[PDB]
């Protein structure tokens, strides 16, 4: 089905929350005999008309995307009175990549991490071909379909580029993931496929740190930033990035991967590699392990 009856979506548990949305595990059980399939259902919480209109666009974006590396749209569910719109997606029980890395570091090696990186990259290349900027590319928004298959799986901040420009200025309520954001996103609120490339470099750092919280992007940058009176956190972050400071090479991270990170973190967006150019290099590295 593409329209799911709200009364047949049986709530099981929370799967996650981010920005202004929440995703819940539900069994779509039309017969009520508890035989239906599990689905992931996203909805808004503490949201006004602005966020509701944004959520409708999020649905239309995900509905239009068709990639082995992008979570599958299944349909929508309209609450009573068509007042609480819900987005129904395939449920990937292995969960998000961040949690997966923190649980299974011992049995994951560089080749497997490079495979994930390659698949994320191909997903992002596809998004770019649809003129879609993700704006929230991070390990917490990647799902594990299987041991050797990941998917980009949250689009709460995603935007479609205008037809006349390859960038988009976005100023919206909520806390930004500033430690994944390129300098032009931090300062000018500009987002593009090349600002996503910056975030992808941070994702590479996350994967080869196994999303260890002690050396996460926030922990690392916050140590570099320090704390100065009348110097807001955003300014200190912009300052250290302009000075050339970057997240460090994760221990045991292959030198080639660290080089790619640094290229993704070029100061100016036009100087960063495209996802189309990163892909073949990641495939080569995964073939060399």
Ligand X SMILES: C[C@H]1CN(C(=O)CC#N)[C@]12CCN(c1ncnc3[nH]ccc13)C2
Annotated binding-site members: 15-23, 42
Instruction: Pick the closer one to ligand X by CB: 89 or 133.
Output: 89
Residues 122-161 that bind ligand X (CB under 6 A): 140-141, 143, 153-154, 156
Helix (H, G, I), strand (E, B) or coil at 58: helix
The contacts found for 272-277 with CB under 8 angstroms, 24 or more apart, are: 272/194, 272/197, 272/198, 273/197, 274/125, 274/128, 274/193, 274/194, 274/197, 275/121, 275/122, 275/124, 275/125, 275/128, 275/193, 275/196, 275/197, 275/200, 276/125, 276/128
* Binding residue for ligand X, selected from 10, 36, 52, 95, defined by CB under 6 A: 95
Nearer to ligand X, 97 or 114 (CB): 97
Residue nearest to ligand X (CB): 16
Q: What is the dihedral of CA 196, 161, 273, 213, to 10 degrees?
A: 0
Verify binding: residue 117, ligand X, rule CB under 6 A.
no
Closest separation in Å from C-beta 110 to ligand X: 24
Q: Which CB atom, from 32 or from 93, has the smaller least distance to ligand X?
A: 93
Beta carbons of 25 and 14 less than 8 angstroms apart: yes
Q: Is 136 known to be catalytic?
A: yes
Instruction: Name residues contacting ligand X, limited to 64-93 (CB under 6 A).
Output: 71, 89-92
Q: Which of the following is catalytic: 29, 50, 68, 136?
A: 136
d(CA 251, CA 110): 12
Q: Report, as residue numbers or ranges, the catalytic residues.
A: 136
Q: Which residues bind ligand X (CB under 6 A)?
A: 15-18, 21-23, 40, 71, 89-92, 95-96, 140-141, 143, 153-154, 156
């Amino acid at each position: 089905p593409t329209i799911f009856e709200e009364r047949h979506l049986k709530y099981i548990s929370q799967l996650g929350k981010g920005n202004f949305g929440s995703v819940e595990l539900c069994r779509y059980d039309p017969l009520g005999d508890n035989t239906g399939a599990l689905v992931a259902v996203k909805q808004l919480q503490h949201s006004g008309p602005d966020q509701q209109r944004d959520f409708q666009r999020e649905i239309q974006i995900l509905k239009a995307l068709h990639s082995d590396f992008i979570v599958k749209y299944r349909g929508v569910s309209y609450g009573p009175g068509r007042q609480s719109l819900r987005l129904v997606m395939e449920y990937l029980p292995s969960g998000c990549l961040r949690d997966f890395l923190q649980r299974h570091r011992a049995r994951l090696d560089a080749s497997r991490l490079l495979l994930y990186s390659s698949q994320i990259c191909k997903g992002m290349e596809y998004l770019g071909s649809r003129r879609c900027v993700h704006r929230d590319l991070a390990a917490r928004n990647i799902l594990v379909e299987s041991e050797a298959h990941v998917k980009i799986a949250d689009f709460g901040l995603a935007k479609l580029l205008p037809l006349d420009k390859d960038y988009y200025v976005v100023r919206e309520p909520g806390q930004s993931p500033i430690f994944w954001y390129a300098p032009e996103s931090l300062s000018d609120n500009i987002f593009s496929r090349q600002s996503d490339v910056w975030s992808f470099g941070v994702v590479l750092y996350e994967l080869f740190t196994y999303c260890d919280k002690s050396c996460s992007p926030s922990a690392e940058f916050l140590r570099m930033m320090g704390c100065e009176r009348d110097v807001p956190a955003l300014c200190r972050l912009l300052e250290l990035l302009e000075e050339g400071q970057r997240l460090p090479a994760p221990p045991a991270c292959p030198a080639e991967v660290h080089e790619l990170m640094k290229l993704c973190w070029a100061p100016s967006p036009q100087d960063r590699p495209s996802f189309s150019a990163l892909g073949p290099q990641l495939d080569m590295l995964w073939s060399g392990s």
